[PDB]
Design a protein around this motif. Structure first.
Motif, short mmCIF file in Angstrom:
data_model
loop_
_atom_site.label_atom_id
_atom_site.label_comp_id
_atom_site.label_asym_id
_atom_site.label_seq_id
_atom_site.Cartn_x
_atom_site.Cartn_y
_atom_site.Cartn_z
N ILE C 85 32.37 22.07 73.20
CA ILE C 85 31.30 22.04 74.19
C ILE C 85 29.97 21.73 73.53
N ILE C 86 29.77 22.21 72.29
CA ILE C 86 28.58 21.85 71.53
C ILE C 86 28.60 20.37 71.18
N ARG C 87 29.77 19.85 70.79
CA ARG C 87 29.93 18.43 70.52
C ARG C 87 30.06 17.59 71.79
N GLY C 88 30.24 18.22 72.95
CA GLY C 88 30.49 17.49 74.17
C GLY C 88 29.32 17.50 75.13
N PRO C 89 29.38 18.38 76.14
CA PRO C 89 28.31 18.41 77.16
C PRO C 89 26.93 18.77 76.65
N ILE C 90 26.83 19.67 75.67
CA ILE C 90 25.52 20.10 75.18
C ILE C 90 24.85 18.99 74.37
N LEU C 91 25.61 18.31 73.51
CA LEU C 91 25.05 17.21 72.73
C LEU C 91 24.70 16.01 73.60
N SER C 92 25.52 15.74 74.62
CA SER C 92 25.21 14.65 75.54
C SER C 92 24.02 14.98 76.43
N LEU C 123 25.29 24.00 66.43
CA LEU C 123 24.07 23.94 67.22
C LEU C 123 22.82 23.64 66.41
N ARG C 124 22.89 23.76 65.08
CA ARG C 124 21.68 23.74 64.24
C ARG C 124 21.01 22.37 64.26
N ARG C 125 21.77 21.31 64.00
CA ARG C 125 21.18 19.98 64.01
C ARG C 125 21.00 19.43 65.41
N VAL C 126 21.68 19.99 66.41
CA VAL C 126 21.37 19.65 67.80
C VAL C 126 20.01 20.20 68.19
#
Ligand SMILES: Nc1ncnc2c1ncn2[C@@H]1O[C@H](COP(=O)(O)OP(=O)(O)OP(O)(O)=S)[C@@H](O)[C@H]1O
Ligand SMILES: Nc1ncnc2c1ncn2[C@@H]1O[C@H](COP(=O)(O)OP(=O)(O)OP(O)(O)=S)[C@@H](O)[C@H]1O
Ligand SMILES: Nc1ncnc2c1ncn2[C@@H]1O[C@H](COP(=O)(O)OP(=O)(O)OP(O)(O)=S)[C@@H](O)[C@H]1O
Ligand SMILES: Nc1ncnc2c1ncn2[C@@H]1O[C@H](COP(=O)(O)OP(=O)(O)O)[C@@H](O)[C@H]1O
Ligand SMILES: [Mg+2]
Ligand SMILES: [Mg+2]
Ligand SMILES: [Mg+2]
Lengths: 130, 174, 325, 546, 348, 329
Positions: C85-92, C123-126
Motif C-alpha cells: 500500500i505504501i508502494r501502491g496507492p500512497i506513492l501514487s 514511507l521515509r523517502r515518500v
DNA sequence: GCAGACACTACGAGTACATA
C-alpha cells in the motif's frame, strides 16, 4: 410420509447447488405448493431462485412437479448438498423429500439395478422469538 | 552483511555536537532573519539531541508559532527528552530512594507517556547505566518481568511503582 | 436536525477553536495553516486528548467540501497499510497532481503505531521526496512503535492529558446543549473520573444522564461503580487501625453494601500510599505487594482471597510502623 | 522521623495502631579509472596472498584432472586427510574420487582469486556462476550441463571449462540436489567443479560436505598482509609505518579487500603519511563481523588474557558479540549444554541456580512474545549470554562442545509419540474409549508386558498341562486384543530373533533399571504360531457364525 | 481382554461403589433436560465408567458399538491436521488435546458443526446428542474460550459431558456453565471388594492381605489395582500373602533419580540428573508427575525441618514450569535449588 | 415438546427480566424509548448476565424479523482475526439501516455489533476496531463483552461506555431463585435456599443449575440443605479440622496423609482454598500469622488459576500454615 | 474456421522473522 415430495432434473439441481456456493455457506430450501425455492443469504446478499410448472417440455426429465401439500422451510449446509450433487449423471431425474422435522431425502433411481438415497439433517434455527 | 561491508568503505557518522548544530542553525537564522536569544538556541540544541532535522523543525515551529526564540517559547511547543529524566530516576533507584524515583515516574505519567514508552526508556537507560554488572543484570531481568505484565494487558501506575520498588529492593538484597 | 449519535461523536470539535487544552500547539498549527507552511506532523499522546479531531478540523479548514475527496487520503488501522500500500496507492497519491484545483495534498495516517516496520521504512523517502506536493500527518499513542527515522522527518507535538480546569467549559457546553441538570460535585466527579480524557467524561455523562436523569456525585459514582473518597479513607483507616478480623469484616461489609471492585480499590489505595508519610522501607513493601495483588486479579482468581491479601499487606506493616516511632 | 507519637497540629493525619494498642500518627497531606583492489589483483600464482598449503592442495586437485581432461598422464589433522585424498588414486573412469572442490572461509581472503588464478594457471577457462544468476533448479541444471558436458567451440587448442560456482551457500536445497545428481550420474562428469562459500555449516551444503574436497581457508598471515599493503602504499606513493599497517590488519580482522579500500579512502591526495589515530578511529574502516558460535562461547566462558581489564568493557563486548553472532536459540542451547562441564568455583550452586533462573526468564519471554504477539519483549534474551559471562568467567581453557541434548530429546520424544500413536491405532475402538493413551502409557504398559510374559517352559503345548493350555489361551487372547504379535528380525551377528511388531519394550523399559528375564526363542515362536492359528480359527468361527 | 475391561459395569445399577451417586445420576438424566456435566476426580476412580453408564441410561444399548472416525481440519496457518474420534449412533467422543495448541481449531470448526445440526432419526435416538470432551484440563484457554458460546447456544440439542482430573485447569466461564460431578477414588475396602469379586468371577481365591497390599500400592487407582492383580495372577498362580507385586519402570526410575540427587550435590551429578530427566521426558511422562515423584521420593530422605521448604520449592518450580514451555529448565532449577538447600543443611 | 434446561428456559427475553443490574438496565430501557444509545462495554464476573442483557435489549429494540439484519454477534467460538475485523466487521458497519418492524413498534436507526468475549481478541484486531467504531457511529453500535477489562486496549476502553456487572446480592438472587422454584412446582426450605445463595456466590447461572439438578435428583420433593451440600462439592468441616490438627501437630507425615486424603476424595483445590481462607480469617490467630497465611492463600489461588498441580500447591500451602501454627508452639 | 503454441497474470505453497 413426507410433507413435500418434488421431482427435479439432476444436472439442473447440480447447477443450482453450485450457483449458491459462491454466495453463502448454508442454503435455505423452501417448498410450498408453487414450487421449490432456493435461497442463500450472506454478507453479500440473498440469492433466490425458483422452479415451477415446467411440464410443457419435450423431455420427460425436465418436469418440475409438486406432489404434496404442506409447505416447508429448512436450512441445510452447502458442502453436503454439493457432495450429494456429485452423483448426478447416474439418474436422469432426482427426487427431493422434506417435512417439518424429517431430514431432506435426495433420491436417485439409478437405471434398473437399484436406487440411492441421501439424508441431510437441517440446521438449528435461530432464536427468532417475538 | 559482511561481504557487502567488505566490498565497500564503511564510513561511520557520529552524532552532531552542539557547536556543529549551532553553526548550521546560525546560518539558517541569518538566512531567514529569525530573532533569537542564546537560551532559546540552547533549548533548540537540547531538544534536537544530535538531530539536525529536529533542530530545523523545532526552530521553524517556534518561529512560526511565536516569532521569537527564547527558552519558554521553545518549551511551549517542544518537549524535553525522556531519557534525561529516566537516567535520574534510575540513579535514584540505584541509591534505593523510592520517593524521588516515584516523583520522576509520576511526572512522566502526568505528561501522557504510555507505560510501554516509559519502560522502553527505563531499559534503554539501564542497558548503558554505570553501575555494578550483576546489579545491572538483576535490573534488566526485573524490567523484563514487568514488561511481560505490561504487554499482557495490565499497565497502570501501580505496576510501574511496583517495578520501581522491586528495583530499589534489588539494591538492598545482595 | 436531531440525530441518534453517541455524545463523543455528536459533540466533536469540527473547528480548531472548539478544542480546549493545547492552546500553544493549536496556535502554532493555525499559524502553519494561515501562512501555508504546514509541515509533516507527528501527533502523539494518551487516548481521548483530541489528535484525530485536530487533524480532521485542520483538513476541513484547508480544503472545501467540493474537493475534499481528492486532496485528503485518510488511512487508519481498519485499512490495510502494508508495504504494497505504501508502494501502491500512497506513492501514487503522493507522486501525482490534483484533479480539480491546484494545491498541496494531505495523507493522514491515523494509528501510525499499528503500521509494520517495513511500511514505516518505505514511507521515509515518500515523505522526503514529495514534501512540496503532499504532507503527511502521523498520529500515534505509543511513540516507541514508530521508527526514529520517521520521528526525525516529522515535527512532533505531545497532545498531553487534558487538565480538569480546561475540561470543565467544554463539558458545560455539552450539558447546556443537551439540557442536563448537573451539580458542582457532579462536574467535579466527572473531571476526576475522566483523568485527562474527554471521551470517558462524555461517555460517563451520557451514561449517568440515561441511568438516573441527574448528574450528581452519588449518581456518577453509582453508575460508574467507582468507590468514593470517604470509602477509600475508611478502608485505609480499617487496614491501619485494627486487627485482621474486624478490618476484614468491615471491608467485606463495605464491598457487599456498595458493590465495589478490587481494581479501583487498589488504584485509590495506591494513590493514598504516597500521600501518607510512610517509611521508605514500608513503602517499597507496600508497593510490591499491591503490584502483586493487581497482577493476580488479571486471571480467574477469587477476589475474596485477594481482598484478604490486600488487608494482609498492611497488617504486616502495622507493628513495623508503630515500633519505628 | 516519618512516624510521630504526638498528633500534628496543622497538617492532616492518619492513625496507625499495632497489635498491642499503642497509637501512632502519620502525615496524610587507467590508474585513476579502477579500484585499488582491481589494480593490485594477483594475475599469477607467485603473487597470491592465501595460505600456501591451500594453494598447493587446490593446484594438485586441479592437476589430478589432466588424465581425463587434457588426455596426458604427466602434468609437466585437516592437512593429513587432504594429503591422503590427493594420493588416494582414481576411479576406473579415470577421475578423482572427489569431483567437486569446496572452498570455505571468512570473507576477504582470496577464495575467488585463488579459484580464478588456479583455473587460469592449469590451462582451464573459468566459467563463473554466482548469486546474481537466477539459481532456479532448471536454470542451474541447464547451466551446469552446458558448462560441463560440452567441448570447446574453438575446436582444437580451445581451453577446457572449469565451472566455478560462487556463493553456493545461498543456493536452495533443490539446486544442491541437482548438482549432486549431476555429480553422481553413472552422463559421466568430465570437467572439474569448484564451489566457493562463506559458511560450510549451512543446512543445504551438508550433503555436499560428504562428497567434496573440503578446503578450508585460514585467515591470512599479518606479516604477508602488512608487506602487501606496504608494497601497495609504495606503488601509490604513500608512506606508512608497519605498526599502523598492523593496526589496520587487526582492525579489519585480516581482510585484504577491506584494508585496501580503507587505505584508498584514508590516503586520497591531501596527505602522504598515515597516522595511528586515523586507523584507531572508528569512523573509517570498522565493519560488523558475524561471530561464530564457538567464538562467542569462548568469549563467554573464558576471560581475555592480560586498558581492557575493566568489567564494563567486557560486559559490552560480550553483549555485542552475542548480539552480532545471530542464531540466538543455538547460543542458548550451547550455554545450557556447556555451563555444567566447567570447573565451577561456586560449590554452593548459587551461580547454577541464578543461571537456570535466567534460562527460565528467556523461556518465559519467548513464550510471552509468541503468545501475546508482543515482540518488543525480545530485547532482553540478548542479555542471556552476557549474564553467563558474569557468572562463569574463568581464566582456564574450557572445551566447548556443540549443543545436542535438546534436539536429541526432541527427536526421541517425537519418535516416542509416533510409537504411542501406532500402538493406540491398533487397538479395538471398544477398548480405546475406556482409557486415554496417557493413562494407558502410565498405568497399562509395564504391567501389560508383565502380563504378556509368563513363566513358560520351552516344551510343546501337547505336553503342557490343561492349566498351561488355559494360560496360553489367555495369553493369545490378550495378545489378539491389543493387536500385538511377534515377528522375526535379522541381526548382523547372524542370529534370528523374535520381536514385537509394535516395539513397546522401548516404551516401557529404562536403561539403568535392573535386568529381567526375557522369553526364549522357542516360546516366542510358539506364541507367534499360536496367534496365527488363533487368527485363522477366529476367521473360521466368524465364517461359521455368519 | 484384560481384567480392567472384562468386568467393567454396563449400567448404573451394577456399580460396586458410589451407589448413592449412581442413583442420583440415574435420577438426574431421566427427564432429559439435564445440563452439561463436568466429571472430575483422580485418575482411575471410575469417571469414564460412570459416563458410559449415563449414556446407556440415556440411549439404548447401542452406545457400546463404537467406531473410529477420522477428521481433517484446516488451521489458520493452512496446515491439515488429522484427529481421531470415538463415535456411536448416538454420541461422539472427542479428545481435542491431540491437536495440541491447535485444539481451538477443533472447538471452533469440528465441534460447532456437530452442535449446529439436529439429528437424523429422532425416534431411535433421543431429542439430543452427546459430545464427550475427554481431558479438558489439557485444553488451552483459547479452546476453553471457544467452548462457552457453543455450550450455551445449542444446549437443547447437544449436551456435553466434559471429563477432567482437576477443575483448577478449567476456566471459571466453563465451570459456571456445567454441573460439576465429583467422582472420588474408591477406598481400600472398595478396591478389595472389587478385586475379590473379579477373582471370584474368574474362579480364583484372593487373600485379604494381598488385596489390601494391592490397594495400598495402587494409591486408590482401580485400573492400576486390577492390572497389578492380573499381573500377580500371571506371574504366580498360588496367591501368597507376601507375594512380590510388580512395579512400573518409570516410578522406580524416578526413585533412582531422586536417590542420585540426594547421594551427591555436585554440578557433575546435576548433569547426570539432567540426563535422567531427559530420559524421563523422552518416554512421554508428564513433567508434573515427574515433579510429584521427585518430591515424594526426596521427602523420605530429608529431615523434619526441611520438608516444608522442599515442598514449597517443588510447588514454585512446578508453577514456573506451567508458565513456561521447556520443562527441563524448571526441573533442573528445582534439582539445583534442592541440592543447594541440602548441602547447606548437611554442612550446617 | 422437548425439555430444555432451566438456564435457557429462564433466560431474560426482555430487559425487565434482568436482575440487580439496575444502571445498565435503566440505560437500555431509556434507549428503548428513543434515547441515544452509546457504545457499550460490559465487564464483570461470570454468570452475572452480560450476554442475556444485550440479547434482551436487541430483541426489544429490533424484534424477531430484524435480528438477522441489525445484529452481528461474533464470539470466541468463531474466528476473529485481523482480517475478520478489517473485512467482515467493517463491511457490516458500512451497511445501510433498512427494514422496519411489522408489529408497529418503533425501531432504532442503528445496527448492533455484539463482540462477545473480547478478551480473546488480539491487540491488532482490537486496534483495527477504533476508527470503525468512531467513523461508522451514525449507523451502527458496538457492545464489547468481557470478563477482564485489562485485556481490552485503552482506546477501546475510551471509545465504549464501561458498565461493570456486579455479583448478585443474596436478596435479589434468593428472590429470583424462589420465583423460579415457584414457577416449576418445586419446594425448597429456607436453610436450603440460604445455603444455595451462599454456595453460588453471585453466579445466577450456577444457582439455576444447582436448583435444576437438585429438583431432578429429589424428583420434585422438598429440597433440604443436605442435597445442596452433596451437589455443591462443599468439603465438610471435619476435613478442615483434621487439616488444621495436622498442621498443629507439626509433623509432615500427617500433613502428607491429610493432603493425599483430600486429593483422593476428589475435592477441588479452589473450594479448599475458600474454606481454609474462611477458617483462617474467622479464628483467634495472630495478625502476623493471618497475614502470612492469607498471602500464601492468594499466591496459591493465583498458581491454581495458571493451571498448576493441585497436590503440590496444596502441600505448599499446608507446609506454610503448619510452619505458622508451629512457630508459636 | 479450428487445433497448436506463446507469454500473461492470478493464485497456491513454502519459509523466515518479529528487539536495541
Ligand atoms: N480537546 C478536546 N476538545 C473537545 N472534545 C474532545 C477533545 N479531546 C477529545 N474530545 C472528545 O473525544 C472525541 C474523540 O477524540 P479523538 O480525536 O479520538 O482523540 P485522540 O486523542 O485522537 O484519541 P485516540 O488517541 O486516537 S483513542 C471527540 O470527538 C470529542 O467528543
Ligand atoms: N595478493 C593480493 N594483493 C592485493 N589484493 C588482493 C590480493 N589477493 C586478493 N586481493 C583482493 O582482495 C579481494 C579478495 O576477495 P575475493 O577473492 O574477490 O572474494 P573472497 O576473497 O572469496 O571474499 P568474499 O567471501 O567473496 S567477500 C579482491 O578484491 C582482490 O582483488
Ligand atoms: N441478571 C440476571 N437476571 C436474570 N437471569 C440471569 C441473570 N444473570 C444470569 N442469569 C441467568 O443465567 C444465565 C447465564 O447468563 P449469561 O448472560 O450467559 O451470563 P454471562 O454474563 O454471559 O457470563 P459469562 O461472563 O459470559 S461466563 C442466563 O441465561 C439466565 O438464565
Ligand atoms: N463400579 C465398578 N466396579 C468394578 N470396576 C470398576 C467400577 N468402576 C470402575 N471400574 C474399573 O476401574 C477402572 C477405572 O477407569 P475409568 O472407568 O476409565 O475411570 P477414569 O477415567 O477415572 O480412569 C476401569 O478400568 C473400570 O474397569
Ligand atoms: Mg483517534
Ligand atoms: Mg568470493
Ligand atoms: Mg457471555
Amino acid at each position: 410420509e413426507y410433507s413435500c415430495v418434488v421431482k427435479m432434473p439432476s444436472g439442473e439441481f447440480a447447477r443450482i447447488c453450485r450457483d449458491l456456493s459462491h454466495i453463502g455457506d448454508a442454503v435455505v430450501i423452501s417448498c410450498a405448493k408453487d414450487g421449490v425455492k432456493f435461497s442463500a443469504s450472506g454478507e453479500l446478499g440473498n440469492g433466490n431462485i425458483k422452479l415451477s410448472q415446467t411440464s410443457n417440455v419435450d423431455k420427460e426429465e425436465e418436469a418440475v412437479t409438486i406432489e404434496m401439500n404442506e409447505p416447508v422451510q429448512l436450512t441445510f449446509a452447502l458442502r453436503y448438498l454439493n457432495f450429494f450433487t456429485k452423483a448426478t449423471p447416474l439418474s436422469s431425474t432426482v427426487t427431493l423429500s422434506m417435512s417439518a422435522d424429517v431430514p431432506l431425502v435426495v433420491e436417485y433411481k439409478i437405471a434398473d439395478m437399484g436406487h440411492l438415497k441421501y439424508y441431510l439433517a437441517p440446521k438449528i434455527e435461530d432464536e427468532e422469538g417475538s | 552483511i559482511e561481504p557487502i561491508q567488505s566490498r565497500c568503505a564503511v564510513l561511520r557518522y557520529t552524532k552532531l555536537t552542539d557547536a556543529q548544530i549551532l553553526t548550521r542553525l546560525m546560518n539558517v537564522i541569518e538566512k531567514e532573519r529569525v530573532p533569537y536569544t542564546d537560551d532559546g538556541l540552547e533549548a533548540i540544541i537540547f531538544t534536537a539531541q544530535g538531530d539536525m532535522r529536529q533542530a530545523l523543525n523545532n526552530l521553524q515551529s517556534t518561529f512560526s508559532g511565536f516569532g521569537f526564540i527564547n527558552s519558554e517559547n521553545v518549551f511551549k511547543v517542544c518537549d524535553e527528552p525522556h531519557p534525561l529524566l529516566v537516567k535520574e530516576m534510575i540513579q535514584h533507584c540505584v541509591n534505593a530512594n523510592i520517593d524521588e524515583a516515584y516523583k520522576i515516574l509520576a511526572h512522566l505519567w502526568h505528561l501522557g507517556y504510555s507505560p510501554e514508552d516509559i519502560i522502553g526508556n527505563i531499559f534503554r537507560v539501564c542497558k548503558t547505566f554505570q553501575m555494578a554488572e550483576y546489579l545491572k543484570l538483576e535490573f534488566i531481568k526485573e524490567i523484563g518481568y514487568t514488561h511481560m505484565k505490561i504487554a499482557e494487558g495490565v499497565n497502570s501506575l501501580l505496576q510501574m511503582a511496583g517495578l520501581l520498588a522491586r528495583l530499589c529492593q534489588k539494591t538492598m538484597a545482595p | 436536525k436531531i440525530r441518534n449519535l453517541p455524545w463523543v461523536e455528536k459533540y466533536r470539535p469540527q473547528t480548531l477553536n472548539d478544542l480546549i487544552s493545547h492552546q500553544d500547539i493549536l496556535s502554532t498549527i493555525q499559524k502553519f495553516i494561515n501562512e501555508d507552511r504546514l509541515p509533516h506532523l507527528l501527533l502523539y499522546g494518551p487516548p481521548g486528548t483530541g489528535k484525530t479531531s485536530t487533524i480532521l478540523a485542520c483538513a476541513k479548514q484547508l480544503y472545501k467540501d467540493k474537493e475534499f475527496g481528492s486532496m485528503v487520503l485518510e488511512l487508519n488501522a481498519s485499512d490495510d497499510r502494508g508495504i504494497d500500500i505504501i508502494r501502491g496507492p500512497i506513492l501514487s497519491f503522493a507522486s501525482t497532481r490534483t484533479i480539480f484545483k491546484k494545491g498541496f495534498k494531505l495523507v493522514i495516517l491515523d494509528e501510525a503505531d499499528a503500521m509494520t516496520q517495513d511500511a514505516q521504512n518505505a514511507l521515509r523517502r515518500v515523505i522526503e521526496k514529495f514534501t512540496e506536493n503532499t504532507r503527511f500527518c502521523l498520529i500515534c499513542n505509543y511513540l516507541s512503535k514508530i521508527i526514529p527515522a520517521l520521528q526525525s522527518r516529522c515535527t512532533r507535538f505531545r497532545f498531553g492529558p487534558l487538565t480538569p480546569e480546561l475540561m470543565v467549559p467544554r463539558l458545560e457546553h455539552v450539558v447546556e446543549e443537551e439540557k442536563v441538570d448537573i451539580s458542582e460535585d457532579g462536574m467535579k466527579a466527572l473531571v476526576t473520573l475522566s483523568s485527562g480524557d474527554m471521551r470517558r467524561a462524555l461517555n460517563i455523562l451520557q451514561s449517568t444522564n440515561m441511568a438516573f436523569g441527574k448528574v450528581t456525585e452519588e449518581t456518577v459514582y453509582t453508575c460508574t461503580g467507582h468507590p468514593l473518597k470517604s470509602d477509600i479513607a475508611n478502608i485505609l483507616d480499617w487496614m491501619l487501625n485494627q486487627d485482621f478480623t474486624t478490618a476484614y469484616r468491615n471491608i467485606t461489609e463495605l464491598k457487599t453494601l456498595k458493590g465495589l471492585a478490587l481494581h479501583d480499590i487498589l488504584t485509590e489505595i495506591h494513590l493514598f500510599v504516597h500521600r501518607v508519610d510512610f517509611p521508605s522501607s514500608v513503602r517499597i513493601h507496600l508497593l510490591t505487594k499491591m503490584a502483586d495483588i493487581e497482577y493476580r486479579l488479571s486471571v480467574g482468581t477469587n477476589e475474596k482471597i485477594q481482598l484478604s491479601s490486600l488487608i494482609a499487606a498492611f497488617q504486616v506493616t502495622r507493628d513495623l510502623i508503630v515500633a519505628e516511632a | 522521623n516519618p512516624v510521630l507519637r504526638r498528633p500534628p497540629i496543622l497538617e492532616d493525619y492518619v492513625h496507625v495502631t499495632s497489635t498491642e494498642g499503642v497509637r501512632a500518627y502519620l502525615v496524610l497531606r587507467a590508474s585513476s579509472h579502477c579500484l585499488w583492489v582491481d589494480e593490485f589483483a594477483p594475475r599469477h600464482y607467485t603473487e597470491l596472498l592465501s595460505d600456501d598449503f591451500t594453494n598447493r592442495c587446490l593446484l594438485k586437485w586441479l592437476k589430478l584432472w589432466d588424465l581425463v581432461v587434457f588426455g596426458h598422464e604427466r602434468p609437466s589433522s585437516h592437512e593429513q586427510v587432504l594429503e591422503e585424498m590427493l594420493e588416494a588414486g582414481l576411479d576406473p573412469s579415470q577421475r578423482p574420487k572427489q569431483k567437486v572442490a569446496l572452498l570455505c572461509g571468512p570473507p576477504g581472503l582470496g577464495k575467488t582469486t585463488l579459484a580464478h588464478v588456479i583455473a587460469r594457471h592449469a590451462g582451464y577457462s573459468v566459467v563463473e556462476m554466482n548469486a546474481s544468476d537466477d539459481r532456479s533448479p532448471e536454470v542451474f541444471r541447464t547451466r551446469i550441463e552446458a558448462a560441463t558436458q560440452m567441448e570447446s567451440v574453438l575446436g582444437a587448442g580451445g581451453k577446457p571449462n572449469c565451472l566455478v560456482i560462487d556463493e553456493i551457500d545461498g543456493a536452495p536445497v533443490a539446486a544442491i540436489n541437482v548438482l549432486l545428481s549431476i555429480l553422481n550420474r553413472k552422463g559421466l562428469l568430465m570437467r572439474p567443479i569448484i564451489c566457493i562459500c562463506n559458511d560450510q555449516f549451512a543446512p543445504s551444503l551438508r550433503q555436499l560436505k560428504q562428497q567434496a574436497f573440503l578446503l578450508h581457508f585460514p585467515p591470512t598471515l599479518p606479516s604477508r598482509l602488512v608487506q602487501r599493503l606496504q608494497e601497495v602504499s609504495l606503488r601509490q606513493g604513500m608512506r606508512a609505518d608497519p605498526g599502523v599497517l598492523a593496526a589496520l590488519c587487526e582492525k579489519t580482522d585480516n581482510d585484504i579487500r577491506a584494508c585496501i579500500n580503507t587505505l584508498q579512502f584514508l590516503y586520497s591526495r591531501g596527505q602522504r603519511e598515515l597516522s595511528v589515530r586515523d586507523v584507531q578511529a572508528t569512523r573509517v574502516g570498522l565493519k560488523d563481523q558475524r561471530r561464530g558460535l564457538f567464538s562467542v562461547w569462548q568469549e563467554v566462558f573464558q576471560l581475555p588474557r592480560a586498558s581492557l581489564t575493566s568489567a564494563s568493557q567486557r560486559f559490552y563486548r560480550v553483549l555485542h558479540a552475542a548480539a552480532s553472532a545471530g542464531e540466538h536459540e543455538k547460543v542458548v542451547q550451547g550455554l545450557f549444554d556447556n555451563f555444567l562441564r566447567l570447573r565451577l568455583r561456586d560449590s554452593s550452586l548459587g551461580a547454577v541456580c541464578v543461571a537456570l533462573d535466567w534460562l527460565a526468564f528467556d523461556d518465559l519471554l519467548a513464550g510471552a512474545a509468541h503468545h501475546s504477539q508482543s515482540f518488543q519483549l525480545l530485547r532482553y534474551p540478548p542479555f542471556l549470554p552476557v549474564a553467563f559471562h558474569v557468572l562463569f568467567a574463568s581464566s582456564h581453557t574450557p572445551r566447548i562442545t556443540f549443543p545436542s541434548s535438546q534436539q536429541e530429546a526432541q527427536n526421541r520424544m517425537s519418535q516416542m509419540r509416533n510409537l504411542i500413536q501406532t500402538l493406540v491405532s491398533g487397538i479395538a475402538p471398544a477398548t480405546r474409549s475406556r482409557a486415554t493413551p496417557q493413562a494407558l502409557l502410565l498405568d497399562a504398559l509395564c504391567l501389560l508386558l508383565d502380563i504378556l510374559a509368563p513363566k513358560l517352559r520351552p516344551v510343546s503345548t501337547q505336553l503342557y498341562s490343561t492349566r498351561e493350555k488355559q494360560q496360553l489361551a489367555s495369553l493369545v487372547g490378550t495378545m489378539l486384543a491389543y493387536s500385538l504379535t511377534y515377528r522375526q528380525e535379522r541381526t548382523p551377528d547372524g542370529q534370528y530373533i523374535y520381536r514385537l511388531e509394535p516395539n513397546v519394550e522401548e516404551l516401557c523399559r529404562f536403561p539403568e533399571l535392573p535386568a529381567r528375564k526375557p522369553l526364549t526363542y522357542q516360546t516366542k515362536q510358539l506364541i507367534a504360531r499360536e496367534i496365527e492359528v488363533e487368527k485363522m480359527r477366529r476367521a473360521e468361527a466368524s465364517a461359521r457364525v455368519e | 481382554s484384560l481384567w480392567v475391561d472384562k468386568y467393567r459395569p454396563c449400567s448404573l445399577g451394577r456399580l460396586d461403589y458410589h451407589k448413592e451417586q449412581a442413583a442420583q445420576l440415574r435420577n438426574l438424566v431421566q427427564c432429559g433436560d439435564f445440563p452439561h456435566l463436568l466429571v472430575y476426580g483422580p485418575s482411575g476412580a471410575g469417571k469414564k465408567t460412570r459416563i458410559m453408564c449415563i449414556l446407556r441410561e440415556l440411549y439404548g444399548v447401542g452406545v457400546e458399538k463404537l467406531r473410529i472416525e477420522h477428521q481433517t481440519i484446516t488451521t489458520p496457518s493452512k496446515k491439515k491436521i488429522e484427529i481421531s474420534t470415538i463415535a456411536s449412533n448416538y454420541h461422539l467422543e472427542v479428545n481435542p488435546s491431540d491437536a495440541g495448541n491447535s485444539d481451538r481449531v477443533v472447538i471452533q470448526e469440528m465441534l460447532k458443526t456437530v452442535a449446529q445440526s439436529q439429528q437424523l432419526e429422532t425416534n431411535s435416538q433421543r431429542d439430543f446428542k452427546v459430545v464427550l470432551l475427554t481431558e479438558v484440563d489439557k485444553l488451552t484457554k483459547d479452546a476453553q474460550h471457544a467452548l462457552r458460546r457453543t455450550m450455551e447456544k445449542y444446549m437443547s440439542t447437544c449436551r456435553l459431558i466434559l471429563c477432567c482430573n482437576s477443575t483448577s485447569k478449567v476456566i471459571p466461564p466453563i465451570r459456571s456453565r456445567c454441573l460439576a460431578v465429583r467422582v472420588p477414588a474408591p477406598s481400600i475396602e472398595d478396591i478389595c471388594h472389587v478385586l475379590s469379586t473379579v477373582c471370584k468371577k474368574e474362579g480364583l481365591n484372593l487373600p485379604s492381605q494381598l488385596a489390601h497390599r494391592l490397594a495400598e500400592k495402587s494409591c486408590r487407582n482401580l485400573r492400576k489395582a486390577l492390572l497389578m492383580c492380573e499381573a500377580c495372577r500371571v506371574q504366580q498362580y498360588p496367591f501368597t500373602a507376601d507375594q512380590e507385586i510388580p512395579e512400573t519402570d518409570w516410578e522406580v526410575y524416578l526413585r533412582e533419580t531422586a536417590n542420585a540427587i540426594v547421594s551427591q550435590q555436585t554440578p557433575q551429578r546435576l548433569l547426570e540428573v539432567r540426563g535422567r530427566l531427559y530420559e524421563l521426558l523422552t518416554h512421554c511422562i508428564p513433567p508434573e508427575i515427574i515433579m510429584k515423584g521427585l518430591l515424594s521420593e526426596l521427602l523420605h530422605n530429608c529431615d523434619g525441618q526441611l520438608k516444608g521448604e522442599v515442598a514449597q520449592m517443588a510447588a514454585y518450580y512446578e508453577h514456573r514450569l506451567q508458565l513456561g514451555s521447556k520443562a527441563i529448565y524448571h526441573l533442573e532449577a528445582f534439582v539445583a535449588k534442592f541440592m543447594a538447600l541440602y548441602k547447606k543443611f548437611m554442612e550446617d | 415438546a422437548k425439555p430444555v434446561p432451566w438456564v435457557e428456559k429462564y433466560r431474560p427475553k426482555c430487559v425487565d427480566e434482568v436482575a440487580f443490574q439496575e444502571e445498565v438496565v435503566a440505560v437500555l430501557k431509556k434507549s428503548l424509548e428513543g434515547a441515544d444509545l452509546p457504545n457499550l462495554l460490559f465487564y464483570g464476573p461470570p454468570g452475572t448476565g452480560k450476554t442475556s442483557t444485550i440479547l434482551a435489549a436487541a430483541r426489544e429494540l429490533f424484534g424477531p424479523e430484524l435480528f438477522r439484519l441489525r445484529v452481528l454477534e461474533l464470539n470466541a467460538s468463531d474466528e476473529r482475526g485481523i482480517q475478520v475485523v478489517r473485512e467482515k466487521v467493517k463491511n457490516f458497519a458500512q451497511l445501510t439501516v433498512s427494514g422496519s418492524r411489522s408489529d408497529g413498534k418503533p425501531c432504532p436507526p442503528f445496527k448492533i455489533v455484539i463482540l462477545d468475549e473480547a478478551d480473546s481478541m488480539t491487540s491488532a484486531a482490537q486496534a483495527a476496531l477504533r476508527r470503525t467504531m468512531e467513523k461508522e457511529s451514525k449507523t451502527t453500535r458496538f457492545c464489547l463483552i468481557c470478563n477482564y477489562v485489562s485485556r481490552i486496549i485503552e482506546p477501546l476502553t475510551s471509545r465504549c461506555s464501561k458498565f461493570r456487572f456486579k455479583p448478585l446480592s443474596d436478596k435479589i438472587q434468593q428472590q429470583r431463585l424462589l420465583d423460579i422454584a415457584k414457577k416449576e412446582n418445586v419446594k425448597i426450605s429456607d436453610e436450603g435456599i440460604a445455603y444455595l445463595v451462599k454456595v453460588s456466590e453471585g453466579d445466577l447461572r450456577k444457582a439455576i443449575t444447582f436448583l435444576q439438578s437438585a429438583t431432578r435428583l429429589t424428583g420434585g420433593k422438598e429440597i433440604t440443605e443436605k442435597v445442596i451440600t452433596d451437589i455443591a462439592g462443599v468439603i465438610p468441616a471435619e476435613k478442615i479440622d483434621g487439616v488444621f490438627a495436622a498442621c498443629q501437630s507439626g509433623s509432615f507425615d500427617k500433613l502428607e496423609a491429610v493432603v493425599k486424603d483430600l486429593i483422593d476424595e476428589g475435592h477441588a483445590a479452589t473450594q479448599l482454598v475458600n474454606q481454609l481462607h474462611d477458617v483462617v480469617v474467622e479464628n483467634n490467630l495472630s495478625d502476623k500469622q493471618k497475614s502470612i497465611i492469607t498471602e500464601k492463600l492468594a499466591e496459591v489461588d493465583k498458581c491454581l488459576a495458571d493451571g498448576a498441580d493441585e497436590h503440590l500447591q496444596l502441600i505448599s500451602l499446608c507446609a506454610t500454615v503448619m510452619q505458622q501454627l508451629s512457630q508459636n508452639c
